[PDB]
Amino acid sequence: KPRNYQLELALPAMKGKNTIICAPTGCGKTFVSLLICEHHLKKFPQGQKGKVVFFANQIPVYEQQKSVFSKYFERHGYRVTGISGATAENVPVEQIVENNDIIILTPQILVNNLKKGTIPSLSIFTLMIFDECHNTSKQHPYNMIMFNYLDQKLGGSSGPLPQVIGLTASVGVGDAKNTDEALDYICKLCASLDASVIATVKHNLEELEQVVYKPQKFFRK
Amino acid sequence: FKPRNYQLELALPAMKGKNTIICAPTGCGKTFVSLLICEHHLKKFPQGQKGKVVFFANQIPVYEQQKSVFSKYFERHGYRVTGISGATAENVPVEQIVENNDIIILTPQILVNNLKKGTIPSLSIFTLMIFDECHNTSKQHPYNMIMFNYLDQKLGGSSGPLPQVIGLTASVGVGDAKNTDEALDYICKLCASLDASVIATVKHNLEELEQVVYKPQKFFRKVESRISDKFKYIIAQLMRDTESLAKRICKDREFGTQKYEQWIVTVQKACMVFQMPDKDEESRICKALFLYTSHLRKYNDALIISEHARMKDALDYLKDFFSNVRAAGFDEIEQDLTQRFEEKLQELESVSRDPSNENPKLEDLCFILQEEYHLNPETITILFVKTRALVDALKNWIEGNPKLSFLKPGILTGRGKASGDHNILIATSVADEGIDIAQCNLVILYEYVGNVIKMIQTRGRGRARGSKCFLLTSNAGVIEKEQINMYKEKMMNDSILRLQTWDEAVFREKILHIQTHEKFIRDSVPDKENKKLLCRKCKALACYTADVRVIEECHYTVLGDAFKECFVSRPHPKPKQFSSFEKRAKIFCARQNCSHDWGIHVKYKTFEIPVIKIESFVVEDIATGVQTLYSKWKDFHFEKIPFDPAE
Amino acid sequence: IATSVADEGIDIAQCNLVILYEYVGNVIKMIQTRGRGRARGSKCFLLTSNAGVIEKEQINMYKEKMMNDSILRLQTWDEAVFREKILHIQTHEKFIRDSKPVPDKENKKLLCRKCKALACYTADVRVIEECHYTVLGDAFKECFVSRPHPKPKQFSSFEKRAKIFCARQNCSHDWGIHVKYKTFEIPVIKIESFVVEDIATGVQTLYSKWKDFHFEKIPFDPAE
Amino acid sequence: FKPRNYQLELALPAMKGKNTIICAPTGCGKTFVSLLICEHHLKKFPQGQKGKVVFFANQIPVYEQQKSVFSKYFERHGYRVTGISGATAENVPVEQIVENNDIIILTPQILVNNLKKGTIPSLSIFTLMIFDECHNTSKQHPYNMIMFNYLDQKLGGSSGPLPQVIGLTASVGVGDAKNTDEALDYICKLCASLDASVIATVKHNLEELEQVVYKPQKFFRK
RNA sequence: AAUAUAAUAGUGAUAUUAUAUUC
RNA sequence: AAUAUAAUAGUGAUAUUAUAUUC
RNA sequence: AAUAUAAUAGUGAUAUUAUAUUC
RNA sequence: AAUAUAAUAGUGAUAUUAUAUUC
Numbered sequence A: 001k002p003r004n005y006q007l008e009l010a011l012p013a014m015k016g017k018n019t020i021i022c023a024p025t026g027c028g029k030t031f032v033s034l035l036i037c038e039h040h041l042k043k044f045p046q047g048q049k050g051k052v053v054f055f056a057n058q059i060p061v062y063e064q065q066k067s068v069f070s071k072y073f074e075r076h077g078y079r080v081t082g083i084s085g086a087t088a089e090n091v092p093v094e095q096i097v098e099n100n101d102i103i104i105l106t107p108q109i110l111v112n113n114l115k116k117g118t119i120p121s122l123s124i125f126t127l128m129i130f131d132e133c134h135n136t137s138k139q140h141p142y143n144m145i146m147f148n149y150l151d152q153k154l155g156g157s158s159g160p161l162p163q164v165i166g167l168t169a170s171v172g173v174g175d176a177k178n179t180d181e182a183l184d185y186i187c188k189l190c191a192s193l194d195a196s197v198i199a200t201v202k203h204n205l206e207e208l209e210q211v212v213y214k215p216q217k218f219f220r221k
Numbered sequence B: 001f002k003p004r005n006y007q008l009e010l011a012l013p014a015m016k017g018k019n020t021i022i023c024a025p026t027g028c029g030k031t032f033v034s035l036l037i038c039e040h041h042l043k044k045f046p047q048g049q050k051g052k053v054v055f056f057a058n059q060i061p062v063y064e065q066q067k068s069v070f071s072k073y074f075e076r077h078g079y080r081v082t083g084i085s086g087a088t089a090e091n092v093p094v095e096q097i098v099e100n101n102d103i104i105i106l107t108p109q110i111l112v113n114n115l116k117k118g119t120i121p122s123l124s125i126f127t128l129m130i131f132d133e134c135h136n137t138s139k140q141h142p143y144n145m146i147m148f149n150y151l152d153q154k155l156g157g158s159s160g161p162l163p164q165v166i167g168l169t170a171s172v173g174v175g176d177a178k179n180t181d182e183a184l185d186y187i188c189k190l191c192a193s194l195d196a197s198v199i200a201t202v203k204h205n206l207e208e209l210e211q212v213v214y215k216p217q218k219f220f221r222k223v224e225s226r227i228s229d230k231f232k233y234i235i236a237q238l239m240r241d242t243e244s245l246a247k248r249i250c251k252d253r254e255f256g257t258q259k260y261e262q263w264i265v266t267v268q269k270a271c272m273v274f275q276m277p278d279k280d281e282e283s284r285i286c287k288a289l290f291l292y293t294s295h296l297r298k299y300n301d302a303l304i305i306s307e308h309a310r311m312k313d314a315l316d317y318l319k320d321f322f323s324n325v326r327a328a329g330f331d332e333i334e335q336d337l338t339q340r341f342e343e344k345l346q347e348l349e350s351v352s353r354d355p356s357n358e359n360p361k362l363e364d365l366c367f368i369l370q371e372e373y374h375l376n377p378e379t380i381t382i383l384f385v386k387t388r389a390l391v392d393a394l395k396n397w398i399e400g401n402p403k404l405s406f407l408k409p410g411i412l413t414g415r416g417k418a419s420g421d422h423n424i425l426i427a428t429s430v431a432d433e434g435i436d437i438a439q440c441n442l443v444i445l446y447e448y449v450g451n452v453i454k455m456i457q458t459r460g461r462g463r464a465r466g467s468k469c470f471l472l473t474s475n476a477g478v479i480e481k482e483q484i485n486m487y488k489e490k491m492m493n494d495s496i497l498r499l500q501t502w503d504e505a506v507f508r509e510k511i512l513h514i515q516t517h518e519k520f521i522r523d524s525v526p527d528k529e530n531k532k533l534l535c536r537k538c539k540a541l542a543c544y545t546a547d548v549r550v551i552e553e554c555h556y557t558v559l560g561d562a563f564k565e566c567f568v569s570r571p572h573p574k575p576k577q578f579s580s581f582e583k584r585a586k587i588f589c590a591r592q593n594c595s596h597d598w599g600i601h602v603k604y605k606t607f608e609i610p611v612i613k614i615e616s617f618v619v620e621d622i623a624t625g626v627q628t629l630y631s632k633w634k635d636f637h638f639e640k641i642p643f644d645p646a647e
Numbered sequence C: 001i002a003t004s005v006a007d008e009g010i011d012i013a014q015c016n017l018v019i020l021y022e023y024v025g026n027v028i029k030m031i032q033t034r035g036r037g038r039a040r041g042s043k044c045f046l047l048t049s050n051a052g053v054i055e056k057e058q059i060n061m062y063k064e065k066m067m068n069d070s071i072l073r074l075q076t077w078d079e080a081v082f083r084e085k086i087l088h089i090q091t092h093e094k095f096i097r098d099s100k101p102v103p104d105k106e107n108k109k110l111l112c113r114k115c116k117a118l119a120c121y122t123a124d125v126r127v128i129e130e131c132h133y134t135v136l137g138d139a140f141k142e143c144f145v146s147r148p149h150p151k152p153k154q155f156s157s158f159e160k161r162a163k164i165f166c167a168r169q170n171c172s173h174d175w176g177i178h179v180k181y182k183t184f185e186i187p188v189i190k191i192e193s194f195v196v197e198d199i200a201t202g203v204q205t206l207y208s209k210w211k212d213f214h215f216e217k218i219p220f221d222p223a224e
Numbered sequence D: 001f002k003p004r005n006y007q008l009e010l011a012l013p014a015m016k017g018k019n020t021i022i023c024a025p026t027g028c029g030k031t032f033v034s035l036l037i038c039e040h041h042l043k044k045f046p047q048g049q050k051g052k053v054v055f056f057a058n059q060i061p062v063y064e065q066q067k068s069v070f071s072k073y074f075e076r077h078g079y080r081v082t083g084i085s086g087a088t089a090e091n092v093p094v095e096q097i098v099e100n101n102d103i104i105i106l107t108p109q110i111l112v113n114n115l116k117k118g119t120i121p122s123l124s125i126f127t128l129m130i131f132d133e134c135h136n137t138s139k140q141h142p143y144n145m146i147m148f149n150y151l152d153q154k155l156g157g158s159s160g161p162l163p164q165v166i167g168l169t170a171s172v173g174v175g176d177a178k179n180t181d182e183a184l185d186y187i188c189k190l191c192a193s194l195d196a197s198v199i200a201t202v203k204h205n206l207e208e209l210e211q212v213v214y215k216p217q218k219f220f221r222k
Numbered sequence E, F, G, H: 001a002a003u004a005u006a007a008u009a010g011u012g013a014u015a016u017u018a019u020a021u022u023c
């Protein structure tokens, strides 16, 4: 039984919109991910099937997400697998991606396999989820994958592209000294993830504030 | 191809770029007129430009026919012909299909819907429009919606180019006009609806036209009603005993008439809103009342059927009814009523097996058929009746009659809830002209009441010289209706010939006036608290208005696993795909074999969902307790939550 | 409160009290049930009004003694000899294991076991993947009702959607299920709900399982 | 309608997805055979997928007839039928026309020219191909050019999905063959041209067929 | 302009003519 | 679900039924 | 639809019911 | 080996160090 604000955060994503989901740490973004993935996979007709890729930037988060998704989606008939640096070598990555509906990856695997050529395009995925998506910027692996995405989009490749969902507790304003510059930075981040929507808790705020409380900060000089 | 002179004469005003209503007798070959107009229209453009024609067929057979003819004819000229009907309208790029074809055959609802969605931005994309049976352009008919768009663009400041409008009809109609002047008004309003400045009729070439389409002679047969009803004498006792049974539970007009039908329907709707503290008892007596009024209705129907046909046919109607009832299941009330019916069955079949009781109308009909087939054994007949029950009735009556043995009957009805060997074709009615069938040199109208347009159109079956049309009735009013319809035709032709004499400019001015007036006329709080939806028969709880979702601002479905326990289902007798929906099965009330029809079960996109009609339910307000009944979902006013796939 | 659990199953909370109410089982389940009593001081009561049940599980205890003793005996044997004996038993079992009735092509009639209404014909019955049986034609569709399945499940290539019942005079006898199989939406019927009348003879016989019903079973062809 | 048994028999190898040359006497109603195969082909696809059938008529009258019949038959089932001939082939978005229609009747030269022009990138857009009078596939005839494209795609390194291929003929021909072995070679070469692994003829149902198409008695007047 | 079939001349590729079709 | 026609009830917007069509 | 276990009649293959599981 | 963040120096690209991660 999901909390209301989780449904509220998941709603723009479930409508097929590329979305940056911004909510405080500990609000249970995992279940949001599960809802988005479930709705995304079940929406496809009989003659078609979706493929979801979940990017976790760290091995503990990788294993956790892999376990949770495997336990949750085994029932619905979706095969969940994962590729980390340990199991990434001397394996048919293309087949592993092809033979599974949900694939949990550390971004470096996809970067390496993309530039190596084993995975020709991102068109193989119908959905992408970046955990801690604020990391998409500069030379970070996230941003490299997204560079592949945008290179395909802005080019004449004319191939189908996956829906992109970011997840973060903060997008960040960067070095911005004022709200205008902040707006520009946030816009550039949205551009990085090709997101047209930023989802935050609005209607359900009072419920959210009964879960994650803001601690008091003191300054000792 | 060798076109007749009157066809060129009719097509001439349209070829001059004039918006034109083409009025000519049914069967004169209007298709060739359309072909000529389209060919000339397409070939008139310079090299750097091209025209786009859209043809409106109101019915699918006409759609396929016209699409085929236009494709076969215009392929050699380098013009692509396509079509979009209800079947092929879904999940297709309508805009591109229109853009990539020169001639497009369409059922009007496609264009109305696509204009409403905005997929087709403007009517400016067409340089020519052709309305088949253009007399249908009026009121809320799809044709008139299209023309609403057209005139909204013309009278507006958009200043976009508009297509030439060509209507086609056998009769424009005078409407309700009691005199020629008012008829002139109606015709002018029609011309305003189609934005037509010209009414084209055959004048110079009439002598050629009259050698193709001949006017059949019309005879009026006025007969007497059957002199004595034994059948109604005894069945009025079953109506009386049933309304006496109803007279036990109630705590609260002639038989065999429409008045009694209206009364018993209003009563049936009155019994659904009665309430008690005990709800199960309420369900019992409401089911009882529903059943009583139902049997009453069926008995009434039997009376009427036997008025217009054999008493055996009415008896068999009731027997079919009770057969179905027996198939439904054993209900105490139904078993009772069927029992009391079965008590009188012997007496009844005793009373319709007698040759003495045969109705005067069927005797006279038999006389007509006998004489006409005696004179001409090769005669092909078509027999129009009001109801399908009468279709079956006369179907059985003909082959159940030894004297009519030369007849080989056939059936023509609608789909919904000479060289061959069929000599006579019994039918209900056919919308407009339709596809040409075998020529009938005998047309029998049995208790038929039409309008002037249908009268003029039915002549198309009699095109051959020597065709005859009889009107047989016991009502004596029907005669008068047909006669005043003939007078209406006179008014029509005279008013048309008067309009043709006007200066075209002045006529355009009057038309513009009418159009602007009509546009002026045309341009002229939902309840948020939860309601209950109860069965209209057993008063059982079916749904809550919070569970109801609205798909495409039209169809209504239900969410939750709760509703799945309230209904049963059986595969749909007539599986049909409407819009984006595909009919699968019928859903009925599941409580104690109530089996009341709640709606249908359909496949919509990826979902398998039930769709219900408010007509089958009673709306109870939780707060007040007041129960209400509703026409259609349009008249039910509450805030309707759109269907969300993500919900 | 529970009915039964196959084998050990998932590990549950530790119960220091296990009560068997009119319960009868084998030695294996007896030893497995102890797994819920792992902690010291756990107790197991067997409560019955039958002088038999007690006797049953004590001969089960004796069976356990025999088991442990026999295992202790087998563990003293030489592994080579044991391999030899095992191979002997294996070959024997394979010999026993390595060691079809003529189908009836006469058209039968499948009648409702309750109301004796005609449901199906054996000419209409088609077999999907050697196991499940369906009914062709639009004739069958007027013989049955359907209700949304209370426990929809996916088995193999099939998806359960509705349950189907008899339509005649509210017989409502359970004839089978209605399923989505590949591209087709089709009913699947069980023979245990029907009576077979060969009306050549006029004889009515009853079959519990489909594989015990021998008639001509034609494969399901999408190309029909 | 009510198909004759030999028609179902002839269509059966095609309805199982095999590339098939159908060889039957002239006037046995091959039209309804095509209708059967096409209907089954289009209805076999799941919801999220759809097929595209292309019918090759070598002559304009046959083109118009087949276009008409297919249109009248498949309109009710929700399949758009169209056609492209020499008259309608110029200054039109042929690629879009192919894309936006389920059943397309072509004269072969349209497909040849449009394949060569590049407007139709691959035959992978069609899930089914039907050649009327398929014995014409040989030498430089347009049919054989189309099949050259097909076979170049098949035998080539990168090969996408390929359409099922159904030929229709009264006679496959033996060529100049002077004996049954050379005839066998010619027939095998023809089957190789159309990529057909099955030759369907009427065998089980022969009596029914011989009640429909009778063989005229031939006399020679010297 | 291209394609097919037939007859012909030639050992053959082909060539002439006849016939049909297509873009 | 929408639309048209006819009869009936009402002064009428409408309403009921019948018939047909469309999406 | 298959599989296992238990009770019950049969000497037994089995059969009925109960329970549980799997595809 | 790659990447991110922070401090510091520099107008800046960057550079040093610290910290963390990934392959």
Ligand SMILES: *O[C@H]1[C@@H](O)[C@H](n2cnc3c(=O)[nH]c(N)nc32)O[C@@H]1COP(=O)(O)OP(=O)(O)OP(=O)(O)O
Binding pocket: E001, E023
């Ligand atoms: O070289 C040919 C050709 O370029 C052109 N031509 C004439 N008809 C066609 C045609 O149907 N298709 C194509 N692709 N090209 C065509 O004309 C040149 C020769 O002219 P002709 O005198 O031989 O042709 P004409 O129209 O006078 O007579 P015919 O075509 O009926 O035989």
Ligand SMILES: *O[C@H]1[C@@H](O)[C@H](n2cnc3c(=O)[nH]c(N)nc32)O[C@@H]1COP(=O)(O)OP(=O)(O)OP(=O)(O)O
Binding pocket: B416, B417, B554, B555, B556, B574, B578, B579, B586, B597, B598, B599, B600, B611, B612, B613, F001, F023
């Ligand atoms: O409210 C209606 C409607 O939502 C839906 N429905 C049924 N047929 C159609 C249709 O042709 N076009 C549209 N837009 N909507 C349709 O069903 C609801 C009512 O169900 P019914 O019981 O009246 O439908 P049924 O098939 O049983 O009768 P009928 O359609 O043959 O007259």
Ligand SMILES: *O[C@H]1[C@@H](O)[C@H](n2cnc3c(=O)[nH]c(N)nc32)O[C@@H]1COP(=O)(O)OP(=O)(O)OP(=O)(O)O
Binding pocket: C131, C132, C133, C155, C156, C160, C163, C174, C175, C176, C177, C188, C189, C190, G001, G023
């Ligand atoms: O003959 C059976 C069978 O073909 C099919 N069926 C039903 N459930 C399954 C299943 O779990 N696995 C397989 N392989 N096949 C199955 O249904 C036919 C009989 O229908 P039932 O009424 O017995 O099945 P139902 O769902 O109504 O009851 P239940 O078995 O789940 O309890």
Ligand SMILES: *O[C@H]1[C@@H](O)[C@H](n2cnc3c(=O)[nH]c(N)nc32)O[C@@H]1COP(=O)(O)OP(=O)(O)OP(=O)(O)O
Binding pocket: H001, H023
């Ligand atoms: O140039 C580097 C590099 O080639 C190699 N190396 C060491 N660790 C890694 C690694 O995690 N991933 C990759 N791709 N390459 C690696 O060693 C060379 C330098 O040796 P170092 O002394 O700097 O590395 P070392 O293991 O000794 O120290 P540390 O990296 O654990 O702190």
Ligand SMILES: [Mg+2]
Binding pocket: A044, A045, A046, A047, A048, A049
């Ligand atoms: Mg799917």
Ligand SMILES: [Mg+2]
Binding pocket: D022, D023, D024, D029, D030, D033, D168, D169
């Ligand atoms: Mg053939």
Ligand SMILES: [Mg+2]
Binding pocket: D045, D046, D047, D048, D049, D050
């Ligand atoms: Mg499909």
Ligand SMILES: [Mg+2]
Binding pocket: D109, D140, D141, D142, E002, E003
């Ligand atoms: Mg060519």
Ligand SMILES: [Zn+2]
Binding pocket: B535, B536, B537, B538, B539, B540, B589, B590, B591, B594, B595, B596
């Ligand atoms: Zn009910």
Ligand SMILES: [Zn+2]
Binding pocket: C112, C113, C114, C115, C116, C117, C166, C167, C168, C171, C172, C173
């Ligand atoms: Zn039954």
